[PDB]
Enzyme design. Structure first.
Site, mmCIF file in Angstrom:
data_model
loop_
_atom_site.group_PDB
_atom_site.id
_atom_site.type_symbol
_atom_site.label_atom_id
_atom_site.label_comp_id
_atom_site.label_asym_id
_atom_site.label_seq_id
_atom_site.Cartn_x
_atom_site.Cartn_y
_atom_site.Cartn_z
ATOM 1 N N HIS A 47 0.831 -1.198 0.000
ATOM 2 C CA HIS A 47 0.000 0.000 0.000
ATOM 3 C C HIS A 47 0.871 1.256 0.000
ATOM 4 O O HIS A 47 2.088 1.177 0.167
ATOM 5 C CB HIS A 47 -1.115 -0.003 1.080
ATOM 6 C CG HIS A 47 -0.660 0.240 2.481
ATOM 7 N ND1 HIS A 47 -0.197 -0.770 3.298
ATOM 8 C CD2 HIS A 47 -0.704 1.356 3.248
ATOM 9 C CE1 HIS A 47 0.019 -0.286 4.506
ATOM 10 N NE2 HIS A 47 -0.281 0.998 4.503
ATOM 11 N N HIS B 214 1.473 3.784 2.024
ATOM 12 C CA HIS B 214 2.075 4.410 3.185
ATOM 13 C C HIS B 214 3.579 4.247 3.284
ATOM 14 O O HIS B 214 4.175 3.307 2.741
ATOM 15 C CB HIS B 214 1.382 3.933 4.462
ATOM 16 C CG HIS B 214 0.037 4.558 4.677
ATOM 17 N ND1 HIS B 214 -0.892 4.049 5.557
ATOM 18 C CD2 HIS B 214 -0.534 5.651 4.118
ATOM 19 C CE1 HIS B 214 -1.978 4.802 5.533
ATOM 20 N NE2 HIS B 214 -1.787 5.780 4.667
ATOM 21 N N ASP C 47 5.561 3.212 5.512
ATOM 22 C CA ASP C 47 6.174 1.992 6.022
ATOM 23 C C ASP C 47 6.193 0.860 4.999
ATOM 24 O O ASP C 47 6.739 -0.219 5.264
ATOM 25 C CB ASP C 47 5.492 1.550 7.327
ATOM 26 C CG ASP C 47 4.038 1.174 7.141
ATOM 27 O OD1 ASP C 47 3.373 1.764 6.270
ATOM 28 O OD2 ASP C 47 3.559 0.295 7.888
ATOM 29 N N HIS D 212 -7.490 -1.234 5.681
ATOM 30 C CA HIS D 212 -6.574 -0.314 6.332
ATOM 31 C C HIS D 212 -6.362 0.896 5.401
ATOM 32 O O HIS D 212 -6.174 2.031 5.851
ATOM 33 C CB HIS D 212 -5.245 -1.034 6.609
ATOM 34 C CG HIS D 212 -4.133 -0.116 6.992
ATOM 35 N ND1 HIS D 212 -3.930 0.310 8.287
ATOM 36 C CD2 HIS D 212 -3.165 0.468 6.247
ATOM 37 C CE1 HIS D 212 -2.879 1.114 8.325
ATOM 38 N NE2 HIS D 212 -2.399 1.224 7.099
ATOM 39 N N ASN E 248 -3.839 3.465 13.411
ATOM 40 C CA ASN E 248 -4.117 4.686 12.668
ATOM 41 C C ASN E 248 -5.066 4.261 11.579
ATOM 42 O O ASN E 248 -4.731 3.406 10.759
ATOM 43 C CB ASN E 248 -2.859 5.273 12.028
ATOM 44 C CG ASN E 248 -3.187 6.335 10.984
ATOM 45 O OD1 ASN E 248 -3.902 7.297 11.262
ATOM 46 N ND2 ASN E 248 -2.665 6.159 9.774
#
Ligand code: CL
Ligand code: OH
Ligand code: ZN
Ligand code: ZN
Ligand code: ZN
Length: 230
Positions: free
Chosen positions: A83, A85, A87, A148, A179
């Site tokens: 994804h 993000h 991280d 998510h 989050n």
């Protein structure tokens, strides 16, 4: 046995074998005062390696490659970010510099760019509709639908029955939602169910963060998501 933030110094990475030719990579990162662990996957593809997600940052990812080069000695030829993000794509520029072909769905690339994050070079087509699945070497890539994040993908290694859920799946110890800023709480349970229906044979389930487990991590995530929703 499974490495925690304890056996891992900030800036370092540890590899853990889940099954034959399948490893999880574990790194850490400080975040708003606290330190969190984070998982990625490594899957042997013939005589080379397929990397799933970065080690959360350029320094961490450079250490991940070094730790791979001196422990498996097989080259990382491709990488997939599950994804948009940081991280998951943070460190993509490092992978690219080292000659790794980086991949992500157009959805992830689009969101990464909008976010100002690093953008994987190659595009994974055929994963735009919930339920879509496509083969990528030694694994199957699956888009369960928004959870998510609207673009989250999960990875399955058919040969080892390993399901890597990324951040769409929580470890048992995570009792509350993390989050969920870019999350789709309304669709999350339904997306988990598509994961359940598509991989009922999974024996090992790797969460985006923390301790691996079995398919029970899916119901656990659902429990946590529902509780947060209310
Ligand atoms: Cl996170
Ligand atoms: O994340
Ligand atoms: Zn995320
Ligand atoms: Zn290329
Ligand atoms: Zn995450």
């Amino acid at each position: 046995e499974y490495p925690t933030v304890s056996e891992i110094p900030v800036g370092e990475v540890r590899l853990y074998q889940i099954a034959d030719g399948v490893w999880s990579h574990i790194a850490t990162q400080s975040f708003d005062g606290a330190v969190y662990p984070s998982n990625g996957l490594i899957v042997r593809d013939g005589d080379e390696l397929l990397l799933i997600d970065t080690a959360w940052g350029a320094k961490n990812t450079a250490a991940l490659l070094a730790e791979i080069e001196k422990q498996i000695g097989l080259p990382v030829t491709r990488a997939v970010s599950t994804h948009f993000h940081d991280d998951r794509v943070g460190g993509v520029d490092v992978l690219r510099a080292a000659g790794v072909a980086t991949y992500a769905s157009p959805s992830t690339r689009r969101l990464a760019e909008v976010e100002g994050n690093e953008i994987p070079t190659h595009s994974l087509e055929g994963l735009s509709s919930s339920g879509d699945a496509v083969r990528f070497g030694p694994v199957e890539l699956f888009y369960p639908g928004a959870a998510h994040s609207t673009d989250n993908l999960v990875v399955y290694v058919p040969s080892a029955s390993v399901l890597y859920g990324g951040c769409a799946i929580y470890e048992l110890s995570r009792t509350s939602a993390g989050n969920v800023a870019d999350a789709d709480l309304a669709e999350w349970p339904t997306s988990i169910e598509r994961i359940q229906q598509h991989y009922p044979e999974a024996q090992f389930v790797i969460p985006g963060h923390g301790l691996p487990g079995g398919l029970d991590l899916l119901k656990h995530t659902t429990n946590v998501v529902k509780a947060h929703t209310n």
